[PDB]
C-alpha cells in the first residue's frame, strides 16, 4: 500500500468526515484529491485484463 495511496486515503477519509459534519475540508486534502483526479490509473492495462 504505497505512500501516495495512503496519503490519498487519509485525505478522502478526512474529507468524508468534514463533509458529513458540515465542516470545511482543509485545503491540503482538496489538493491531494485534485492531484488524484489529474493522474488517473492506467485504465488501458486494466482492459488487457
Amino acid at each position: 500500500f504505497t505512500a501516495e495511496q495512503s496519503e490519498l486515503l487519509k485525505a478522502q477519509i478526512t474529507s468524508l468526515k468534514c463533509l458529513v459534519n458540515r465542516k470545511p475540508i482543509p485545503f491540503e486534502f482538496q489538493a491531494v484529491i485534485q492531484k488524484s483526479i489529474n493522474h488517473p490509473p492506467d485504465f488501458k492495462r486494466m482492459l488487457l485484463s
Partner: protein, 107 residues
C-alpha cells in the same frame, strides 16, 4: 498475465480514483447548494434544493462503500466487493463504475 497482487493494486487504484471524482463532485454541488440557499427565493418550496441534497447523499454513500472496500482489500478479506457498483443517479463517473463492476466480476 495480471498477478493477484496486480489485480489487487488495480482494484485499490480504481476505487481511490472514483472516490476522488465523487468527492470533487460533492464539493461542487455543495458550493452550489450553499449559493442557491443564500441567493434564491421561496426556498421552502424549491424542489432543486432537496434533489441536490439527495444527490449528495448518493455520492457520499458511494465514497463510504468504496472506503470500506479498500479497507477490506488491504485486510486481505477474500472476495471483498463494493456494496454499490452503480453510478449515482460522455460522463466519466458512469464509464468508471462500469469498469469497476467488470473488475469485480472478472477478478
Amino acid at each position: 498475465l495480471p498477478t493477484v497482487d496486480e489485480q489487487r493494486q488495480y482494484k485499490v487504484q480504481l476505487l481511490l480514483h472514483i472516490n476522488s471524482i465523487l468527492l470533487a463532485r460533492v464539493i461542487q454541488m455543495n458550493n452550489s447548494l450553499q449559493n442557491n440557499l443564500q441567493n434564491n427565493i421561496n426556498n421552502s418550496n424549491n424542489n432543486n434544493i432537496i434533489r441536490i441534497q439527495q444527490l449528495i447523499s448518493q455520492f457520499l454513500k458511494r465514497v463510504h462503500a468504496n472506503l470500506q472496500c479498500i479497507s477490506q482489500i488491504n485486510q486481505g478479506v477474500p472476495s471483498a466487493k463494493p456494496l454499490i457498483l452503480t453510478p449515482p443517479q460522455q460522463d466519466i463517473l458512469s464509464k468508471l463504475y462500469l469498469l469497476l463492476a467488470r473488475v469485480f466480476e472478472i477478478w
